[PDB]
Design a protein around this ligand. Structure first.
Ligand SMILES: *[C@@H]1O[C@H](CO)[C@@H](O[C@@H]2O[C@H](CO)[C@@H](O)[C@H](O)[C@H]2NC(C)=O)[C@H](O)[C@H]1NC(C)=O
Ligand SMILES: *[C@@H]1O[C@H](CO)[C@@H](O[C@@H]2O[C@H](CO)[C@@H](O)[C@H](O)[C@H]2NC(C)=O)[C@H](O)[C@H]1NC(C)=O
Ligand SMILES: *[C@@H]1O[C@H](CO)[C@@H](O[C@@H]2O[C@H](CO)[C@@H](O)[C@H](O)[C@H]2NC(C)=O)[C@H](O)[C@H]1NC(C)=O
Lengths: 146, 150, 49, 195, 116
């Protein structure tokens, strides 16, 4: 617009997200959040008191941005997307990003969370040929087996 | 090398499809030249054409694509052709690779003023034939702008 | 398809044209409406796919 | 291949089928956004030899005397028009394109362009004129025509939405709104914006 | 034959946590999409050899685009962006150091008092 005075007098905008595919609601729950992923390759965090949007991230619209798997752990979200190629760790509290890594070739089959001695410290990724275990804090690969 | 293309023309009282042979086009790709060899109209052909022009009929031209693999055709008002003493222009639009795309027929002058034309003015085909490949679009000139900016 | 509309179309048929484009075969066609709501082929173009 | 790709443009008549114009632009690749209005056509494309986005404008003119000022029958136009073409460089990508409308067509015509970032740009049509001369002349001065320049610039002041960005834009719609100076614009993508 | 582009983004006077939640980094105009980390750094993956334009989009701050040329082996270089006289080369540091210039101006000002 112009003049910085007619702002909101004639124009209006409505934001949206696609059809829900995965969701996660377990939280503190002192903080009021609802992390969702849609079929429009968009991942957002909706306020639960009113239903607004706290933050939203939009990926590629083609098939190279489809979300394959989603998990939650404490205050972090783990996402596997791009046909089992990209893995990301979203920080829910700020909406930024902890880390993002690229897996090897293959087809994604299942995603799991493992731990030892009453403490979760690894992420397990299964592809039609191999199985990999990566660190949870930094995402560095721990090992891979055939 | 030179190739030959059949050219058929059709006109009927009830505006149906009754295409029959009219002429042949000789096309030379080397120098890119086009020529036409045709025949003059018969007597009952002239009568039928006069009837069609009276009834505001149409005159259709059709050529094949491969020198029953397909056809490309067009049409023109018959009265606008009769009153023009059979003076017409044909254009053959070709593809960039060299494939026949379309055929267009026009007359000079256009329109229908409702004159009267006797039989002695319908003996010759004053026909022009033209070939048309696609042109080349220009690009954004920059060198002149750069040197003038100095 | 009322009687008045049918009469108006019967009067105004030879002034309405349809054109169709087939992208799979790259074929363009053009038909002219007739008096009895039938269509007849008028022009045709082809672009090699 | 990056050296044997082209985009073809055909201007045809819908009644008879005459190909009024045929053109081919070489070293070009899609997608293509095109606007065809009262007298002109403006289409955008991507050039691979220089790797930049380009606009191309075609404008049609008749001679100096009207063939017929009472009607326009497509069966009685045996003279081809005159085509003027020009091209420009646009320093961004494009997600959508549209043209404004008005009741009587008295106000100037603008192109609304939807960029991938989210903003919407309003570009005057008078800037894209094929008649702009490369070498200024006295006749150009008396016509009040800006000399040719190969680049069009993007300024933040020209955005019609200050910061109400629309993400993954897909369509722009314009309405006359019963007044000769205002046009209603609705941009729909993932979001919906109205102004 | 797949490579990555790395860089950092800094807004002077504002700590990163206030603006990274509504920003993206675009390579070749939505051809490749990336997101910013908590501290501001960013990485984009699966970039084939060629030439690309990398920019950072945010609805509240300005960032200049940078051209990146990546060869067949993997060695990459950074330079300015210019569409007229494309052969001109001006070197820029790599990995990318993209610093903002300030908020954009969407509005038009007016005139103040004239004579004292
Ligand atoms: C034969 O056909 C031509 C095709 O247009 C008719 O038109 C003449 O064409 C010549 C060639 O360019 C021009 O010099 C004339 O000025 C055109 N005539 C008019 C009235 O403009 C032509 O009239 C036809 N008849 C002949 C040549 O006797
Ligand atoms: C301009 O075109 C119109 C439309 O065809 C012409 O008007 C027709 O003219 C014919 C004879 O010339 C008449 O039989 C029709 O009744 C007219 N129809 C209408 C609706 O007016 C007009 O003559 C053309 N003008 C010129 C100078 O050729
Ligand atoms: C888009 O720009 C407008 C500019 O007016 C922002 O609105 C201003 O926001 C500041 C900060 O809260 C307020 O102090 C001003 O009073 C607001 N202006 C008006 C006219 O109300 C708006 O916040 C910007 N959008 C976003 C998402 O930040």
């Amino acid at each position: 617009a112009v003049y910085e005075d007619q702002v909101g007098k004639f124009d209006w905008r409505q934001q949206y997200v696609g059809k829900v595919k995965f969701a996660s609601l377990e939280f503190s729950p002192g903080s009021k959040k609802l992390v969702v992923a849609t079929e429009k390759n968009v991942i957002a965090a909706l306020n639960s008191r009113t239903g607004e949007i706290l933050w939203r991230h939009v990926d590629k619209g083609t098939a190279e941005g489809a979300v394959d798997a989603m998990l939650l752990h404490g205050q972090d979200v783990i996402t596997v997307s791009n046909g089992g190629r990209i893995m990301r760790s979203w920080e829910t509290n700020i909406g930024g990003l902890n880390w993002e890594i690229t897996l090897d070739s293959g087809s994604f089959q299942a995603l799991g969370l493992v731990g030892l001695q009453e403490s979760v410290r690894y992420i397990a990724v299964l592809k039609k040929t191999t199985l990999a275990l990566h660190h949870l804090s930094s995402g560095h690969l721990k090992w891979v087996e055939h | 090398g030179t190739v030959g293309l059949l050219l058929e023309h059709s006109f009927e009282i009830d505006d149906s499809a009754n295409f029959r042979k009219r002429g042949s086009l000789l096309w030379n790709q080397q120098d890119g030249t086009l020529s036409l060899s045709q025949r003059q109209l018969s007597e009952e052909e002239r009568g039928r054409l006069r009837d069609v022009a009276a009834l505001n009929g149409l005159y259709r031209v059709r050529i094949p694509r491969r020198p029953a693999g397909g056809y490309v055709s067009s049409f023109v008002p018959a009265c606008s052709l009769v009153e023009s003493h059979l003076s017409d222009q044909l254009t053959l639009h070709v593809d960039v690779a060299g494939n026949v795309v379309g055929v267009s027929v026009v007359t000079h002058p256009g329109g229908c003023r409702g004159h009267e034309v006797e039989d002695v003015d319908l003996e010759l085909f004053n026909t022009s034939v033209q070939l048309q490949p696609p042109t080349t679009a220009p690009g954004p000139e920059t060198a002149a702008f750069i040197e003038r900016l100095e | 398809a009322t009687r008045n509309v049918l009469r108006q179309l019967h009067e105004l048929a030879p002034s309405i044209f349809f054109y169709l484009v087939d992208a799979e075969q790259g074929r363009l066609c053009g038909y002219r409406l007739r008096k009895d709501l039938t269509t007849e082929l008028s022009w045709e173009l082809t672009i090699p796919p | 291949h990056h050296e044997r790709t082209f985009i073809g443009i055909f201007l045809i008549d819908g009644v008879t089928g005459r190909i009024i114009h045929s053109s081919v632009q070489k070293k070009a690749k899609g997608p293509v956004h095109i606007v065809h209005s009262e007298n002109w056509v403006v289409y955008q494309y991507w050039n691979t030899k220089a790797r930049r986005n380009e606009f191309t404008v075609l404008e049609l003119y008749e001679g100096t005397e009207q063939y017929n000022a009472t009607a326009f029958s497509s069966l009685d136009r045996p003279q081809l028009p005159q085509v003027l073409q020009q091209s420009y460089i646009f320093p961004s990508s494009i997600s959508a394109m549209e043209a404004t409308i008005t009741e009587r067509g008295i106000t100037s015509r603008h192109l609304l362009i939807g960029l991938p970032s989210g903003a919407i740009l309003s570009l005057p049509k008078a800037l894209l004129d094929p008649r702009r001369p490369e070498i200024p002349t006295e006749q150009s001065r008396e016509e009040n025509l800006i000399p040719y320049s190969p680049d069009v610039q993007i300024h933040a002041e020209r955005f019609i939405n200050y910061n109400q960005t629309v993400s993954r834009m897909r369509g722009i719609y314009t309405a006359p709104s019963g007044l000769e100076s205002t046009c209603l614009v609705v941009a729909y993508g993932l979001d919906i914006y109205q102004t | 034959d797949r490579f990555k582009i790395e860089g950092r983004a800094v807004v002077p006077g504002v700590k990163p946590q206030d603006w990274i939640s509504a920003a993206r980094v675009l390579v070749d105009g939505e051809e490749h999409v990336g997101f910013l980390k908590t501290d501001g750094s960013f990485v984009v993956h699966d970039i084939p050899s060629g030439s690309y334009v990398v920019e950072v989009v945010s609805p509240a701050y300005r960032f200049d685009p940078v051209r990146v040329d990546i060869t067949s082996k993997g060695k990459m270089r950074a330079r300015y962006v210019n569409y007229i006289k494309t052969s001109e080369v001006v070197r820029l540091p790599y990995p990318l150091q993209m610093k903002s210039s300030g908020p954009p101006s969407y509005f038009i000002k007016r005139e103040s008092w004239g004579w004292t």
